[PDB]
Every structure is written in C-alpha cells, then in structure tokens.
Amino acid sequence: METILEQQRRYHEEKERLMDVMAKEMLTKKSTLRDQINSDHRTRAMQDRYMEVSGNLRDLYDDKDGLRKEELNAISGPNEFAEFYNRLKQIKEFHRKHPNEICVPMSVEFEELLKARENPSEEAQNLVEFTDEEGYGRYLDLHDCYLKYINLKASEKLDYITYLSIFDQLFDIPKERKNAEYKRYLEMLLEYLQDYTDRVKPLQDQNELFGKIQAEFEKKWENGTFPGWEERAQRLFSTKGKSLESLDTSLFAKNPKSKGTKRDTERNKDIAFLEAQIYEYVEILGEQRHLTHENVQRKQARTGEEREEEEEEKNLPLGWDGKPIPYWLYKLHGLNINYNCEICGNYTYRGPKAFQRHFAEWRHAHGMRCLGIPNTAHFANVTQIEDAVSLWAKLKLQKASERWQPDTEEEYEDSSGNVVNKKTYEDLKRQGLL
Amino acid sequence: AHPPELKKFMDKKLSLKLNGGRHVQGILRGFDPFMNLVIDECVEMATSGQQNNIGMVVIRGNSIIMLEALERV
Amino acid sequence: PNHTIYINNMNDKIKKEELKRSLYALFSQFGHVVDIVALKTMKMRGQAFVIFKELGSSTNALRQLQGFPFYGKPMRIQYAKTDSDIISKMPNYILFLNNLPEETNEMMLSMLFNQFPGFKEVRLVPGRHDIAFVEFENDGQAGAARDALQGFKITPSHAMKITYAKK
Amino acid sequence: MKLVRFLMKLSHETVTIELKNGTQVHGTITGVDVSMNTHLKAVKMTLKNREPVQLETLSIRGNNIRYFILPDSLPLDTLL
Amino acid sequence: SAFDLDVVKLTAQFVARNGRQFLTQLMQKEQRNYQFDFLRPQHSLFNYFTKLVEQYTKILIPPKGLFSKLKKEAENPREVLDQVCYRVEWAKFQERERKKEEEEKE
Amino acid sequence: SIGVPIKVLHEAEGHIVTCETNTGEVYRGKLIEAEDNMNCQMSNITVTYRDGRVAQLEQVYIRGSKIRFLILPDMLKNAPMLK
Amino acid sequence: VKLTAELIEQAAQYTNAVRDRELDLRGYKIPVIENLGATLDQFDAIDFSDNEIRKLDGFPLLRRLKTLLVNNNRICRIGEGLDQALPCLTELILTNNSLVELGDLDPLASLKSLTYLSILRNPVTNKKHYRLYVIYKVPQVRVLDFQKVKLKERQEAEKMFK
Amino acid sequence: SSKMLQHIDYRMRCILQDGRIFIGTFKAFDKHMNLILCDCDEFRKIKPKNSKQAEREEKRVLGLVLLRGENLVSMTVEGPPP
RNA sequence: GGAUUUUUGGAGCAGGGAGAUGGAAUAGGAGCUUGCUCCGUCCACUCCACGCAUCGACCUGGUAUUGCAGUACCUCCAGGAACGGUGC
C-alpha cells in the first residue's frame, strides 16, 4: 500500500483530530471536579493518541528513505497510473456513499451527550480514581496509612494531632522509628499518595517528571543536597553522620558503607525510595494535606446533621371566598369520606358527587386510555383495574358476538355441492380454482 | 416442637453413621423430639473393621448424620 | 417434522457427556442448543436427541448432516416423531395440498401451514376427499414452506406436498 | 442488654471484620440486624492465606464471624 | 463512494509528484485514452481534490514524513498543552473578530 | 416464622434429590421424608461418603444439620416461593 | 453495524446443553468483537451464532472460558493471543468457517488446554495431510471432527514433514 | 431489615462451611436464612499438594440447591440477573 | 428464643524418613561484601513402605449393541496412574 505516503496520511489524520480535540477540551470545560480530573487525564490521553501517531511517524523511515528514491523518478507516469487505474476500474457499481473515510476522528476525539467522551470515551472518567469522600481531587486517602501506623505503633494517644503532625512535615525527627518497617509503611502510604498525585497532575509530562525525580534520587540527595555547619553532612535515609563532606562520601564506599550494615546504601534502597517519595509528596501537597486536614477538623467537630448530610453530599375546605366551611355544613357535605380511585394513580377523593363526576373528569379519562379500555360509561364506578379488565373482557366478547361478521357467517358453496365461508371461498377462488 | 418420623422404622434395623466416622448397627428402639434414636442390639463399628456389641445404645442425634435401613418395615 | 431432532448411528464406546460436547459444538451451527436428551441405557443406546429452536433448523441439521462422519460411524440425524418436553411446556400465495389427509387434525395442519410467516388459512377440501388449499398471508412464506414440503412427511403413511396453485 | 445492640450502632461506619474462615476484611457494611447479621460492602476480604478479594455487596454472617473492629472516631459509651 | 474516494486518492498521489506547473503525471491521464472526471476545476470535486492535495503536501513536507520525524508529538503532552492553548488563543481572537464584524455590519 | 426454605424442602422431598452433608456424605436418591428440622429420610439413594465409592443404599436417615446443601427438582424453578 | 455490550449483556448467559454457562448472541450478524468481558466472570461460553466476524480475534481475558461458538461466521484467519485469554478453553467450535491454509494453524498449537475442537466446512478440510497437520500441532486434543484422535495418527503427524 | 432482599434473583456467589464459592441465582431468605439457590453451581480448590503443580477448581453444578442454614460464610453477587 | 438439626461455632494445626543429589537471579545470619563453611521455609529425580486400599471419570487398542426418551453414572479385557475425597 502507501507506506511512505499513506502512513503519513493516517498520522496526519490522527494528529489533526487529536489537535482539534485537544484545543476544544483545553479551551472549553465543565463544572464537575471529578470530571475536571478525568478531563485533565483525557487531555493527557489525547496527547497520548497523538503520541501513538507520533511514535509511528517519527521513526517511520523504513518506507520513506527507500521509496523516496524509487518514487524519485521523473520519467514514468500514466503507465503505472494505468496499472493502478485499470485495477481500480473493477465493478464498483455499488451505488452507496461512505463518510467513514474521513468522518472517524470527530467521533473519536469529540464529546458525547451524557458523558463528554469520543469513540475511545466509553469508560473515560474518574471511575475508580475517586473514592467516597476523596472527591476526585478534594480529599485523599490518609485513613489507610493511618490505620497501618496505628496497627504498627499501638499507642494509647496516637490521635489526630500526632497523625497530622507526622503526615504534614517532610523530614523532621520522625514520631516513629524509621530503622524499623515504619519507613517501608511510609513508603507504601507514599505509593498510594504518589498514585493520587499522578492522577491529580495528569496534563504534566509523567515520564519527564519521572526523569527529573530520577535525577533527584541519583544526585540531589547524596551529592550534598542538605548542607550543614557530625553537622557537616548526615543522612536521614542512612543514619550515618559525617565529619565533613569528604568523610561522608568516603563512608559511602568504605567497607562498613559497602556491605557491613543491614542499612547499607543498597540494603536501605527500598526504605530510602519510600522516604524520598514520601518527603516529595508531602512537600508538594503541603497545601493539599492542609486542605485535607481542615476538612478532617470539620469532620471531627461539625454538627451531626451537617456532617452526615455532607458526607452524603383545620383542613377546612375552601369556599368561593377562600375561608373555612362551618362545621354543620362540612358534616352535610360529608368531606370526611374518601374514595380510593385506583384508576387515577391511587388518587383518593373527598366529596361523593365530586368522586362521581371524576369518572368523566380527565384523570379518570387518562387512566382509562392508558389502561387500554375506552372511557365509556359501562365501567364508571368500577375502580379496580382487574375488575375493569375482566368486565371489558366479557364486554369485548359480547360486542364481537353481536357483530355480524361476513367472513365467518356469510358462507359460500363451491360448485362441487359443498359449502365454505366467504373467506375460504375467495381464498381458494383467487389462488386458482374457484 | 415436632417429633421425628421414625414411626414405621421403629423396632427395625438401621446402620447409622455418627460423628467420629463411627457406625452403630442396631434396632430403632426409642427417641424424643430431640431425635435421640436409641438402639438396642446396637454394636459399634470403628475405623478398622473392629465391632463391639454395646447392649443398648441411646445414640443422640447430636452427631449421627446418617443411618440406612436393613429392611422395608 | 420436529424441532426435536434425532441424532444417532454413532459409537457406544463414546461417552454420553463427551458426545454431548461434540454434539453441542456441531449443533450450535446448524441450529440452537436448548437441551440434549441423551440416554445410554440399553433400550436406546448409541443415540440421543437435540432440541433445536426451530423445526426447520432441526430438519436442516438433518438434511445437511444426512450422514455426517463422527464417533465410529457416520451419524445420521433426522426430525423426530414428536417434540421434547421443554418445547412441550413452551411459487404463489395459495397452494393445493395433495395427499392431504382425510384424517389430519386441523390444529397440527395449522401449525404446519404457519411454520412459515403466518399463513392466511388452510381449507381441507371437504367434498371429494384427499385435497386441500392453503393460503399464506406471506406468499414468499407459502412458496418457501411448500417447496420444502414437497414430499413432506406428516403422519408418515404419506407425503404431503404443496405446489403453486395453477391459473 | 447485649453488645449485639452495640454493634447495631454501625451504619455508614468504617469497620474491619475478622470472620470464621480465617477471614480478615475491611468493610463498610450495609446493615446489621439483631443476630449480628452485618452485610459487607466495597469490602476487601482475605481469608486464610488469601488475596484482597473485593465485594461491592456482600452479606457477612453472624456466628460465622470472630472479631469486629469499629471506627476510631466512635465513642464507645455512646455506642453501647 | 469508496471508488470515487480511491480515484481522488490517486489524484492526490499524482498532485504530490507533479513537479512542474505544466509537466506532471496527470497531464497524460487527462487526454490519454481514459476518463478524467476529477480533472475539472469547475467540478465541486476539485475542492475535495485540493483538500487531498493539501493532505499529500502535509505528508510531503520533510517534517511531515519524508526522512525526519520529531517526537515532541509522539512523547509530548507539554507541547500538546501549548498547542491546545494556541488553538484556544486563535479561537478567542476569532470570536472577537466575529463579534466586531457583526457589530460593524449592523 | 415459617420458611419458604421449608416450602422448598417440601417441594424437594418425595422424589430424586441429592443431599450433601458435612464430611462429604452426599446421598442422591428419593429424599422421602424431610421434616422442617431437615432430618431427611432418603430412599434408594446413592451416597458417596465423599469416598468415591458412591454406593447405593436404601432408606437412609441423613440428618440435615450436617447437610451442606440439597439439589432439588430442577422443574420447580418457577416456585411459588420466589415466582 | 455496531456490536456493543448491549448485545453482550442482553445475551443469554445460562445453562448450555452440557450444563455449563453459555452466552448466546444469535441473530445479529455482529462483525465487531469488542466489549465482552462484561460477562463478569460468570461465563464460560461465548456464542455468536449468525455473525460475520472478519476473522478469529477480539476476545477479552477469560481465564474460565469453556465453550465458544464462532460458527456461521466469516473466520478467515486465526489470531495470536488466544491461550492466555482462554486457558480453560477446550471448546472453540469454528465450523462453517472459511479457514484456508495451514498458515491459519499457527496459533492453534500454543494452547495446553485444547481437546474439543471443530473447524469443519473449511477449505482446509479436503486438503491432503490436513488432519495430519492437525494431529501434529494439537498434542492434548481428544475430540477432533467428532471422532477420537489416534496414536497412529500422532505417529504419522510427528514423523512426517521433518 | 432484609438486606439481601434487593440482591436476590441474580447469580450470587454464596460462601460455604468449608470455603467454596457457589454462584446460584439466589431466591430467598429466612430466620435461619437457608438458601434456595437456583441455576446454582459450585467450585472449590483442586489442591495440587505441591507448588510445581498449580491450583485450580473443578466445576460442579447442583442446579437448584437447598443449602441448609449452617452454610453461609458470606453472600456476594457474581452474576447480574438473567 | 447462646444446650442433641442450621446463626454465639470442634476451631485451630502439622504434612512420613535420607543420600559428597540441586535451584533462591531481585530476599535470609554469623564467621565483619567477593570466595568458602554450617544453619532453623519447597519442589524435580532416585531408596524405602511410587505415603498405603476402595471407587469414579478419563488416554490406549480390541471388543456388544441400530436402538426412542427425558439421566446420580451405564459394555467387556487389559495397562497406566495425569485428577478427587473416604479409613490409617
């Protein structure tokens, strides 16, 4: 086919539809916050659709570099054109059109009626990316890491203040031993938090932020990122101090810095990555954890109605002059008595002649129509619907009875001295005997 | 509060599976609405083929989850 | 005909469940699988029946698999004499039925004529016996089932064939 | 009085149930009746040597439960 | 139709390789013993042929798939955000243009 | 009160059913007399004892206290209990 | 025509002929193999009676699948990732299909679970040594053309075509 | 309350006294809550007794099963209602 | 309405011995990493007492039946144990 041409055709269609969808999605918006998070993810993913197009088109030289010399001739023409056209002159008499030759990318990268999603957009949303209270980017999951820390430390006063202080700061002297599995548990809570952050910043280059964080882990901690004035250099992930920078470096690759401690440079690798990710996530969400902490303060001290709902967030009849009707008169009119009209949507009526006229009033008329039985008098005052249908059933039977139907009654002898009905007579008459 | 239907099976032979995988081979003799079927001429059957005649076993339905018939009654 | 189709003439060293799996794989194509009534007792060995959704489906699996190779001997499938318990609990427009029974029940004759997209009515000629004329509210339906009924068995003592009524 | 009525003080309540078949699950149960009948929801369950299996609407039994864990913001005397 | 669209694709393939204003691979196809029904400019299909030629040119620019391919699209959501904002800024200027033109005409 | 479970057991008694008990004692046969306390009397049954020699006995008294389950008439799927 | 999860959820997922969970979609001519995993781990058979599926491909991760009907379809070839998506698979009945050449038997052998198969009514049928190619490539097979496989057939099929 | 009374009539995995999962189109409850599972099957662990052999489950179907009240360890939904 | 049939539980647990037999790349301790020695979780092969019997399904070839009915499961001989739980 067309590889160095049709490949670029497909790639141009893909990137152009992606650019139109990206322009529309990044220019107009919606009101919803879960929708906003999902839509930042969707703008990143539209960049990703253009990204698949580009991963196909940017190394696509295996067709270009070779077909640009064979299609780089200036002699030929209608010969190969005629080979192609004589192949194309097959029986294409199939008279119909196709807009599914250019009309794909709008339905692919456009908005829908109920959820603004394209052909890909059947499950495009913050479906599993938003928990109950989290709010698609309003609150986060600190309860789970809090429960893990509770089951770890088991402290009769490990309460809101201690939890918030341990989860707000970056690198203080921690409220638990990091020389135990508490560091790994912080790394797991930080893995959950970092997933939350990779969902809450979706339009940012994920791979590029990863590469920046990798250069961070590889130079910015261990190459003198924390200066000092034992105080020249020390590690919060190693727990070894330095008489100076050169002493720190030399103890990094010395014997007891190579394999002579279970907290060595690699033997603390997992807990070190946990510490680094946790510190970065906290120091980024210093505002996010702050809003979550304010929310938690509200959810601790706010009143019950507001808190629960936000987690979940004389009969006297009228006269013409609009006053009570006096009592002997009310008794006369007998309004107390109510009539269950089932036909009327379980409407129930006060006043007896009122009830009766209702049978020709609208609500009863509608009721009838939708019952499948006309509002003829014969059923008036029959209010239950099974009674109505059996009544109208026998009524139907009687109407069909007393109808004179020529088909079954009006009867015809054939020529052969035996008789049939009108219907069968004409039937076999016009299907070729009579 | 309803007695069990061992009524035509009474005074007849059943081979019962009670807990401990055990068997009690005997005659249906007596019961309560507690289903405590009591077997006289009842003999134990262990895990191994060893069997001892027990005289009169009042075998509680506390365990016996099976019992088959020797006749039609 | 029948929607319950007889499928037999295979081997007995094959299992009921295994031959059922084979029959399912080979029957979901020519018809629908509702239930496979398979008995491997001696009085009916080496045989089973598949109850297909449509009577023409069953007879068409019978007419295509008219001796299809399988399980030790080419298996033969036909319609049954009656239908299964599941389905039991459940060219012109007019054509003369020749070899029309003077014995047939108009109910089963109606279910036959309305095998097609609903027939107009059947008129079993009540003078000189052994004739009928049936019309269908869909002429393509009439011609379809009348051509597929040319030589059709109903009360197998005869073949009930319907051709296009003449001019 | 019984603590079955104390466990009756649980609806929209974040709990953790260690059940009879070596089970341990985190759950916001649906609704609990007098015989401890507490049906789980969005629950991550792990029996003996298991996985975090998910049930969006599940019905955890009574006497086939072992241990219950209430919320942390749950006043005990007010719950019994 | 698919056949007519294929013929237009061949017209674009000929307009990508037509290297002179009076010399090309379609001058022969016009009066060379076959039918040439996309060769009209007064046909409305001339406009779709011009769009297909623009597409062939978007594939024939060296930055468009000849011998160089840039990965700021295949791995670039930041340049994609820049491009979304650029489309949006063009749209804002254009909305202003439409409003001013409507007011001036009124 | 009264159990549509017990109505199901009454619709499952009298004919071929297949009870399955605690240690694997599973009896497939005529579950003749079952009382709402589930002490099921089976008749002409084939019971496995989970032993894979699933042998046929007659008129067994398989208690329902150990009954893990009970395969009932597949024809009463349209029961009056559920409907 | 769009074959959706409309026609896959409205499909019938209930007792098959051999008493297994089958999900029929008869009467659609569905050529689109998408949106299927919404059988929700309660299905083992996926049936597309009256389909025009351009080839054999397009299924989701079903570690449970126990029967599939791709007969009366437009199967021309056979796609690759079939085993990891059907490890419990023995019945992939693709008769009345249009497989042609033994290059359509390339992913056929990678399954460890294939025993009950049907590709009947294909031009791969009357070709010489076609059942030989099948009895070579299918080790664990037991049901082939609705009659048992043979150790003599396996000897022929391994020994030939060295 | 009768919590399950909404989730019945669908294929629901009921749990066992011994740890199986049985997806029956559950019907109804009780005070003992004995299950009447229609179109109901079972599946339990085929224990390899080893690790270079892996663990599976062989398919068993009872159809409609009257699971005595001592059974349920849980009741979850594994199939929507057909 | 937590006492012999169902929802205040009898649930938990552990896989028989050994050979200078072996695998743990990313995971165990000390002899202060590499090398090497001994040490408290499995599987593959082999020795016992293929952990021991029953039966069921199946793979192998031979072998009896051509037949209509709603199934726990329906041939017989012989091998092998790929799989299940029952007594120790």
mmCIF file with all atom_site columns, C-alpha atoms in Angstrom, chain A residues 18-136:
data_model
loop_
_atom_site.group_PDB
_atom_site.id
_atom_site.type_symbol
_atom_site.label_atom_id
_atom_site.label_alt_id
_atom_site.label_comp_id
_atom_site.label_asym_id
_atom_site.label_entity_id
_atom_site.label_seq_id
_atom_site.pdbx_PDB_ins_code
_atom_site.Cartn_x
_atom_site.Cartn_y
_atom_site.Cartn_z
_atom_site.occupancy
_atom_site.B_iso_or_equiv
_atom_site.pdbx_formal_charge
_atom_site.auth_seq_id
_atom_site.auth_comp_id
_atom_site.auth_asym_id
_atom_site.auth_atom_id
_atom_site.pdbx_PDB_model_num
ATOM 1   C CA . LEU A 1 18  ? -6.082  14.931 18.248  1.00 0.00 ? 18  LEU A CA 1
ATOM 2   C CA . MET A 1 19  ? -5.187  18.624 17.930  1.00 0.00 ? 19  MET A CA 1
ATOM 3   C CA . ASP A 1 20  ? -8.799  19.655 17.328  1.00 0.00 ? 20  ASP A CA 1
ATOM 4   C CA . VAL A 1 21  ? -9.995  17.548 20.277  1.00 0.00 ? 21  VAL A CA 1
ATOM 5   C CA . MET A 1 22  ? -7.169  18.912 22.450  1.00 0.00 ? 22  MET A CA 1
ATOM 6   C CA . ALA A 1 23  ? -7.958  22.516 21.516  1.00 0.00 ? 23  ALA A CA 1
ATOM 7   C CA . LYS A 1 24  ? -11.649 22.043 22.314  1.00 0.00 ? 24  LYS A CA 1
ATOM 8   C CA . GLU A 1 25  ? -11.001 20.129 25.551  1.00 0.00 ? 25  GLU A CA 1
ATOM 9   C CA . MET A 1 26  ? -8.411  22.636 26.786  1.00 0.00 ? 26  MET A CA 1
ATOM 10  C CA . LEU A 1 27  ? -10.457 25.692 25.759  1.00 0.00 ? 27  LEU A CA 1
ATOM 11  C CA . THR A 1 28  ? -13.952 24.751 26.939  1.00 0.00 ? 28  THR A CA 1
ATOM 12  C CA . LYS A 1 29  ? -14.600 22.945 30.221  1.00 0.00 ? 29  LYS A CA 1
ATOM 13  C CA . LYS A 1 30  ? -17.350 21.703 32.521  1.00 0.00 ? 30  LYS A CA 1
ATOM 14  C CA . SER A 1 31  ? -18.455 22.327 36.110  1.00 0.00 ? 31  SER A CA 1
ATOM 15  C CA . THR A 1 32  ? -17.649 18.975 37.769  1.00 0.00 ? 32  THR A CA 1
ATOM 16  C CA . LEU A 1 33  ? -14.455 18.292 39.704  1.00 0.00 ? 33  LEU A CA 1
ATOM 17  C CA . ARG A 1 34  ? -14.276 14.533 39.155  1.00 0.00 ? 34  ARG A CA 1
ATOM 18  C CA . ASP A 1 35  ? -14.995 15.463 35.537  1.00 0.00 ? 35  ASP A CA 1
ATOM 19  C CA . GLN A 1 36  ? -12.161 18.017 35.705  1.00 0.00 ? 36  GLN A CA 1
ATOM 20  C CA . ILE A 1 37  ? -9.674  15.416 36.970  1.00 0.00 ? 37  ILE A CA 1
ATOM 21  C CA . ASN A 1 38  ? -10.814 12.884 34.359  1.00 0.00 ? 38  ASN A CA 1
ATOM 22  C CA . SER A 1 39  ? -10.646 15.620 31.698  1.00 0.00 ? 39  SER A CA 1
ATOM 23  C CA . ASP A 1 40  ? -7.068  16.546 32.562  1.00 0.00 ? 40  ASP A CA 1
ATOM 24  C CA . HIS A 1 41  ? -6.371  12.820 32.241  1.00 0.00 ? 41  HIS A CA 1
ATOM 25  C CA . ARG A 1 42  ? -8.229  12.880 28.917  1.00 0.00 ? 42  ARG A CA 1
ATOM 26  C CA . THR A 1 43  ? -6.215  15.820 27.590  1.00 0.00 ? 43  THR A CA 1
ATOM 27  C CA . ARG A 1 44  ? -3.058  13.933 28.560  1.00 0.00 ? 44  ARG A CA 1
ATOM 28  C CA . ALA A 1 45  ? -4.504  10.855 26.832  1.00 0.00 ? 45  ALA A CA 1
ATOM 29  C CA . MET A 1 46  ? -5.328  12.861 23.697  1.00 0.00 ? 46  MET A CA 1
ATOM 30  C CA . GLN A 1 47  ? -1.720  13.981 23.707  1.00 0.00 ? 47  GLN A CA 1
ATOM 31  C CA . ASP A 1 48  ? -1.150  10.220 24.054  1.00 0.00 ? 48  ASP A CA 1
ATOM 32  C CA . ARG A 1 49  ? -3.233  9.429  20.959  1.00 0.00 ? 49  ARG A CA 1
ATOM 33  C CA . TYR A 1 50  ? -1.209  11.970 19.015  1.00 0.00 ? 50  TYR A CA 1
ATOM 34  C CA . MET A 1 51  ? 1.637   10.208 20.858  1.00 0.00 ? 51  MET A CA 1
ATOM 35  C CA . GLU A 1 52  ? 0.918   6.830  19.291  1.00 0.00 ? 52  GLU A CA 1
ATOM 36  C CA . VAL A 1 53  ? 0.571   8.588  15.928  1.00 0.00 ? 53  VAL A CA 1
ATOM 37  C CA . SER A 1 54  ? 3.965   10.223 16.530  1.00 0.00 ? 54  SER A CA 1
ATOM 38  C CA . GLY A 1 55  ? 5.634   7.014  17.711  1.00 0.00 ? 55  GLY A CA 1
ATOM 39  C CA . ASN A 1 56  ? 4.552   5.556  14.383  1.00 0.00 ? 56  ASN A CA 1
ATOM 40  C CA . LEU A 1 57  ? 5.511   8.597  12.283  1.00 0.00 ? 57  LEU A CA 1
ATOM 41  C CA . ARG A 1 58  ? 8.789   9.781  13.861  1.00 0.00 ? 58  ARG A CA 1
ATOM 42  C CA . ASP A 1 59  ? 10.776  6.578  13.278  1.00 0.00 ? 59  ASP A CA 1
ATOM 43  C CA . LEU A 1 60  ? 8.803   5.772  10.109  1.00 0.00 ? 60  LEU A CA 1
ATOM 44  C CA . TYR A 1 61  ? 11.790  5.979  7.780   1.00 0.00 ? 61  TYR A CA 1
ATOM 45  C CA . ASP A 1 62  ? 11.862  2.309  6.715   1.00 0.00 ? 62  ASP A CA 1
ATOM 46  C CA . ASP A 1 63  ? 9.408   3.282  3.968   1.00 0.00 ? 63  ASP A CA 1
ATOM 47  C CA . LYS A 1 64  ? 10.433  6.896  3.345   1.00 0.00 ? 64  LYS A CA 1
ATOM 48  C CA . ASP A 1 65  ? 14.214  6.553  2.960   1.00 0.00 ? 65  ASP A CA 1
ATOM 49  C CA . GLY A 1 66  ? 13.703  3.754  0.430   1.00 0.00 ? 66  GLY A CA 1
ATOM 50  C CA . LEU A 1 67  ? 10.586  4.740  -1.513  1.00 0.00 ? 67  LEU A CA 1
ATOM 51  C CA . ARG A 1 68  ? 11.792  8.342  -1.947  1.00 0.00 ? 68  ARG A CA 1
ATOM 52  C CA . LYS A 1 69  ? 14.355  7.093  -4.489  1.00 0.00 ? 69  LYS A CA 1
ATOM 53  C CA . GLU A 1 70  ? 12.027  4.794  -6.449  1.00 0.00 ? 70  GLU A CA 1
ATOM 54  C CA . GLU A 1 71  ? 9.272   7.427  -6.349  1.00 0.00 ? 71  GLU A CA 1
ATOM 55  C CA . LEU A 1 72  ? 12.013  9.995  -7.036  1.00 0.00 ? 72  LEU A CA 1
ATOM 56  C CA . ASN A 1 73  ? 11.861  9.391  -10.802 1.00 0.00 ? 73  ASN A CA 1
ATOM 57  C CA . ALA A 1 74  ? 10.776  11.984 -13.378 1.00 0.00 ? 74  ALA A CA 1
ATOM 58  C CA . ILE A 1 75  ? 10.173  9.770  -16.439 1.00 0.00 ? 75  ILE A CA 1
ATOM 59  C CA . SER A 1 76  ? 7.271   7.383  -15.783 1.00 0.00 ? 76  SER A CA 1
ATOM 60  C CA . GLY A 1 77  ? 3.640   8.242  -15.135 1.00 0.00 ? 77  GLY A CA 1
ATOM 61  C CA . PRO A 1 78  ? 0.487   7.147  -16.972 1.00 0.00 ? 78  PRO A CA 1
ATOM 62  C CA . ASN A 1 79  ? 1.991   3.637  -17.305 1.00 0.00 ? 79  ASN A CA 1
ATOM 63  C CA . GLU A 1 80  ? 1.897   2.856  -13.571 1.00 0.00 ? 80  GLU A CA 1
ATOM 64  C CA . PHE A 1 81  ? -1.072  5.219  -13.305 1.00 0.00 ? 81  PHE A CA 1
ATOM 65  C CA . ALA A 1 82  ? -2.853  2.972  -15.823 1.00 0.00 ? 82  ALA A CA 1
ATOM 66  C CA . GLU A 1 83  ? -1.894  -0.205 -13.984 1.00 0.00 ? 83  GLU A CA 1
ATOM 67  C CA . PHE A 1 84  ? -3.459  1.292  -10.842 1.00 0.00 ? 84  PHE A CA 1
ATOM 68  C CA . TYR A 1 85  ? -6.483  2.733  -12.675 1.00 0.00 ? 85  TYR A CA 1
ATOM 69  C CA . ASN A 1 86  ? -7.203  -0.469 -14.621 1.00 0.00 ? 86  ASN A CA 1
ATOM 70  C CA . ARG A 1 87  ? -7.165  -2.291 -11.307 1.00 0.00 ? 87  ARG A CA 1
ATOM 71  C CA . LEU A 1 88  ? -9.457  0.454  -9.938  1.00 0.00 ? 88  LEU A CA 1
ATOM 72  C CA . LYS A 1 89  ? -11.858 0.097  -12.887 1.00 0.00 ? 89  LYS A CA 1
ATOM 73  C CA . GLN A 1 90  ? -13.372 -3.082 -11.436 1.00 0.00 ? 90  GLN A CA 1
ATOM 74  C CA . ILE A 1 91  ? -17.101 -3.356 -10.856 1.00 0.00 ? 91  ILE A CA 1
ATOM 75  C CA . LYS A 1 92  ? -17.651 -0.569 -8.317  1.00 0.00 ? 92  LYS A CA 1
ATOM 76  C CA . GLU A 1 93  ? -21.334 -0.170 -9.305  1.00 0.00 ? 93  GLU A CA 1
ATOM 77  C CA . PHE A 1 94  ? -22.230 -0.473 -5.628  1.00 0.00 ? 94  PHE A CA 1
ATOM 78  C CA . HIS A 1 95  ? -24.203 2.775  -5.501  1.00 0.00 ? 95  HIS A CA 1
ATOM 79  C CA . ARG A 1 96  ? -23.753 3.998  -1.929  1.00 0.00 ? 96  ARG A CA 1
ATOM 80  C CA . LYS A 1 97  ? -21.533 6.506  -0.175  1.00 0.00 ? 97  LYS A CA 1
ATOM 81  C CA . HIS A 1 98  ? -19.154 6.359  2.746   1.00 0.00 ? 98  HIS A CA 1
ATOM 82  C CA . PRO A 1 99  ? -18.332 9.164  5.177   1.00 0.00 ? 99  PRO A CA 1
ATOM 83  C CA . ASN A 1 100 ? -16.351 6.568  7.171   1.00 0.00 ? 100 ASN A CA 1
ATOM 84  C CA . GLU A 1 101 ? -13.362 7.595  5.045   1.00 0.00 ? 101 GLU A CA 1
ATOM 85  C CA . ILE A 1 102 ? -12.782 10.961 6.743   1.00 0.00 ? 102 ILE A CA 1
ATOM 86  C CA . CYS A 1 103 ? -15.558 11.005 9.365   1.00 0.00 ? 103 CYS A CA 1
ATOM 87  C CA . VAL A 1 104 ? -13.848 8.944  12.123  1.00 0.00 ? 104 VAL A CA 1
ATOM 88  C CA . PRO A 1 105 ? -11.690 11.354 14.179  1.00 0.00 ? 105 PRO A CA 1
ATOM 89  C CA . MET A 1 106 ? -14.555 13.620 15.280  1.00 0.00 ? 106 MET A CA 1
ATOM 90  C CA . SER A 1 107 ? -16.427 10.653 16.769  1.00 0.00 ? 107 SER A CA 1
ATOM 91  C CA . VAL A 1 108 ? -13.037 9.544  18.150  1.00 0.00 ? 108 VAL A CA 1
ATOM 92  C CA . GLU A 1 109 ? -11.891 12.750 19.894  1.00 0.00 ? 109 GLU A CA 1
ATOM 93  C CA . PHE A 1 110 ? -15.160 14.644 20.418  1.00 0.00 ? 110 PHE A CA 1
ATOM 94  C CA . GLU A 1 111 ? -17.645 14.988 23.291  1.00 0.00 ? 111 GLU A CA 1
ATOM 95  C CA . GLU A 1 112 ? -20.734 12.851 23.894  1.00 0.00 ? 112 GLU A CA 1
ATOM 96  C CA . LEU A 1 113 ? -24.258 13.683 25.039  1.00 0.00 ? 113 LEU A CA 1
ATOM 97  C CA . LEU A 1 114 ? -24.276 12.129 28.531  1.00 0.00 ? 114 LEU A CA 1
ATOM 98  C CA . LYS A 1 115 ? -20.517 11.881 29.126  1.00 0.00 ? 115 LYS A CA 1
ATOM 99  C CA . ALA A 1 116 ? -18.228 14.015 27.002  1.00 0.00 ? 116 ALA A CA 1
ATOM 100 C CA . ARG A 1 117 ? -16.226 11.123 25.541  1.00 0.00 ? 117 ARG A CA 1
ATOM 101 C CA . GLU A 1 118 ? -15.305 10.109 21.987  1.00 0.00 ? 118 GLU A CA 1
ATOM 102 C CA . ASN A 1 119 ? -15.018 6.688  20.337  1.00 0.00 ? 119 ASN A CA 1
ATOM 103 C CA . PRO A 1 120 ? -12.408 5.837  23.000  1.00 0.00 ? 120 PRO A CA 1
ATOM 104 C CA . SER A 1 121 ? -14.687 7.564  25.524  1.00 0.00 ? 121 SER A CA 1
ATOM 105 C CA . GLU A 1 122 ? -16.861 4.623  26.554  1.00 0.00 ? 122 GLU A CA 1
ATOM 106 C CA . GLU A 1 123 ? -15.246 4.363  30.000  1.00 0.00 ? 123 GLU A CA 1
ATOM 107 C CA . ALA A 1 124 ? -13.453 7.733  30.049  1.00 0.00 ? 124 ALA A CA 1
ATOM 108 C CA . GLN A 1 125 ? -13.935 9.107  33.564  1.00 0.00 ? 125 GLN A CA 1
ATOM 109 C CA . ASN A 1 126 ? -12.621 9.220  37.119  1.00 0.00 ? 126 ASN A CA 1
ATOM 110 C CA . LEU A 1 127 ? -14.413 5.927  37.800  1.00 0.00 ? 127 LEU A CA 1
ATOM 111 C CA . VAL A 1 128 ? -12.018 4.118  40.153  1.00 0.00 ? 128 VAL A CA 1
ATOM 112 C CA . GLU A 1 129 ? -9.887  7.270  40.571  1.00 0.00 ? 129 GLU A CA 1
ATOM 113 C CA . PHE A 1 130 ? -12.336 8.807  43.076  1.00 0.00 ? 130 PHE A CA 1
ATOM 114 C CA . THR A 1 131 ? -13.186 7.271  46.446  1.00 0.00 ? 131 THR A CA 1
ATOM 115 C CA . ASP A 1 132 ? -16.178 8.055  48.642  1.00 0.00 ? 132 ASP A CA 1
ATOM 116 C CA . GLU A 1 133 ? -15.066 11.222 50.454  1.00 0.00 ? 133 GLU A CA 1
ATOM 117 C CA . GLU A 1 134 ? -11.903 11.869 48.386  1.00 0.00 ? 134 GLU A CA 1
ATOM 118 C CA . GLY A 1 135 ? -13.903 13.887 45.869  1.00 0.00 ? 135 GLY A CA 1
ATOM 119 C CA . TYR A 1 136 ? -11.909 13.260 42.663  1.00 0.00 ? 136 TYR A CA 1
#
